[PDB]
């Protein structure tokens, strides 16, 4: 199996540089989050999806610093193209528990709606059609691309719909502050990745894989590690209200 | 990329013929199965989740007749191991949404539950652990086959649950028939999933590619089709009984 593919360049060597630091950085945050949240379980209010979502993050983390560049981290592939397995089995795990927390912002509604549905169904296509588009080449690379783009559009606009609820439903004041920034937070953060999608080395080679790498643990501590932690905050902001006049 | 693995033997002739008819009688009901559920919609009620499994199996069926041993069909690997992408990326298509047709399986609760987000949450997880077994290769394919196992142990339980809920939700008599037979079916066939995977080139290989091929059609169609159809009879119950009773 040579491919002369699969060689190729990894980065600039500061490019590596800065996805290693960038991952212990992300591992130790992952780390102390984690640690936060058990305490909270233990004394306050914590719900599951950012314990999930950061247990996760910090796995995928230790995996892309030790075997990035390995099986069940990168296929090779007959095409020549190195596709990051790792990451879109991560974006698998986490986003569909990213968007269960985006549906019932605040944890009480027990319930959820078909929205709900919706917003899981188009993430999981998305998802499933950008791994498709990685690992696609050529033509088809750009019909699946654009297939995720459609997914992720109705995704978009549930978030969206979802985000614009959980605002009318938190309490006026702090809540809903952190209602916005928990928006922002997660378009910037989902929109800049189909963006190094095309950048990286899966569609536009501009990026390098280290470059690519750095961007997406950039991206992945904000949607996944500072979002859970603004949900976090939000949720014990209503535990708060409801304790004081709910 | 020569990589004499990917060449080895897709099947002995008369399995590719077997595969072959299958996916020609598997278009055939999904068709048939689009166009009785297109005119539900026109005429009666019909409910998203069925269509939406049915297309996909059309599509998938499709694809698998004619570039199924294609890439975004069949990843080659540098480790020599033909990953059946298509497979796996429609199971995270259907079987989110066949999970969701479980939870409601009357299509009266407008409302979901947090065992539908735990049902979900581990389907996803176990198709994204077998897909990593599926291009792990080694011990690393073991130990993601059996992480795959504790999700799917995970969501088999969670489907139980379900399937004795929606038991005792639905009207005594046919409805409950029919809550059983979906729940054998389901059973029957999401348990010879992970078998057809330790026999299939993806684990032990004693199946080759299109004997796998052959089996998980016929799980296909009895998982997708037959327990869509099924689940739609039960829909078309309940909304007579609620006409007549209701
Ligand atoms: C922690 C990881 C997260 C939140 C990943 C989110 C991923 C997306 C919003 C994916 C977007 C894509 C498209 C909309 C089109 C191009 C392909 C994708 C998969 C990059
Ligand atoms: C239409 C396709 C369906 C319903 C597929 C269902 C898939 C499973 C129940 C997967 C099971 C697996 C495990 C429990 C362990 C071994 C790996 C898998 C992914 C085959």
Same mark, same amino acid.
């Given at each position: 199996? !040579?491919?002369?593919? *699969? %060689?190729? $360049?990894?980065?600039?060597?500061?490019?590596?540089?800065?996805?290693?630091?960038?991952? &212990?950085?992300?591992?130790?945050?992952? %780390?102390?989050?984690?640690?936060?949240? @058990? !305490?909270?379980? &233990?004394?306050?209010?914590?719900? *599951?999806?950012? %314990?999930?979502?950061?247990? #996760?993050?910090?796995?995928?983390?230790?995996?892309?610093?030790?075997?990035?560049?390995?099986?069940?981290?990168?296929?090779?592939?007959?095409?020549?193209?190195?596709?990051?397995?790792?990451?879109? @089995?991560?974006?698998?795990?986490?986003?569909?528990?990213?968007?269960?927390?985006?549906?019932?912002?605040?944890?009480? $509604?027990?319930?959820?709606?078909?929205?709900?549905?919706?917003?899981?169904?188009?993430?999981?296509?998305?998802?499933?059609?950008?791994?498709? $588009?990685?690992?696609?080449?050529? !033509?088809?690379?750009?019909?699946? /691309?654009?297939?995720?783009?459609?997914?992720?559009?109705?995704?978009? /606009?549930? @978030? @969206?719909?979802?985000?614009?609820?959980?605002?009318?439903?938190?309490?006026?004041?702090?809540?809903?502050?952190?209602?916005?920034?928990?928006? *922002?937070?997660? /378009?910037? $953060? *989902?929109?800049?990745?189909?963006?190094? /999608? %095309?950048?990286?080395?899966?569609?536009?080679?501009?990026?390098?894989?280290?470059?690519?790498?750095?961007?997406?643990?950039? #991206?992945?501590?904000?949607?996944?590690?500072? &979002?859970?932690?603004?949900?976090?905050?939000?949720?014990?902001?209503?535990?708060?209200?409801?304790?004081?006049?709910?």
């Amino acid at each position: 199996c !040579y491919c002369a593919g *699969w %060689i190729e $360049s990894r980065g600039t060597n500061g490019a590596q540089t800065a996805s290693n630091v960038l991952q &212990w950085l992300a591992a130790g945050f992952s %780390i102390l989050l984690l640690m936060f949240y @058990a !305490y909270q379980t &233990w004394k306050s209010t914590c719900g *599951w999806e950012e %314990i999930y979502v950061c247990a #996760i993050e910090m796995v995928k983390v230790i995996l892309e610093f030790f075997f990035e560049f390995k099986n069940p981290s990168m296929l090779y592939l007959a095409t020549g193209h190195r596709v990051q397995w790792l990451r879109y @089995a991560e974006w698998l795990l986490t986003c569909p528990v990213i968007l269960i927390h985006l549906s019932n912002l605040t944890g009480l $509604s027990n319930d959820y709606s078909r929205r709900t549905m919706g917003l899981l169904v188009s993430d999981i296509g998305t998802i499933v059609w950008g791994a498709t $588009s990685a690992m696609a080449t050529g !033509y088809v690379k750009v019909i699946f /691309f654009c297939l995720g783009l459609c997914y992720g559009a109705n995704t978009f /606009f549930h @978030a @969206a719909k979802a985000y614009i609820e959980g605002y009318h439903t938190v309490p006026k004041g702090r809540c809903r502050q952190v209602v916005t920034g928990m928006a *922002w937070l997660f /378009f910037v $953060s *989902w929109g800049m990745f189909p963006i190094l /999608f %095309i950048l990286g080395p899966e569609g536009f080679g501009v990026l390098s894989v280290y470059g690519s790498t750095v961007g997406h643990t950039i #991206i992945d501590l904000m949607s996944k590690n500072c &979002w859970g932690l603004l949900g976090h905050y939000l949720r014990v902001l209503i535990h708060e209200h409801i304790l004081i006049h709910g």
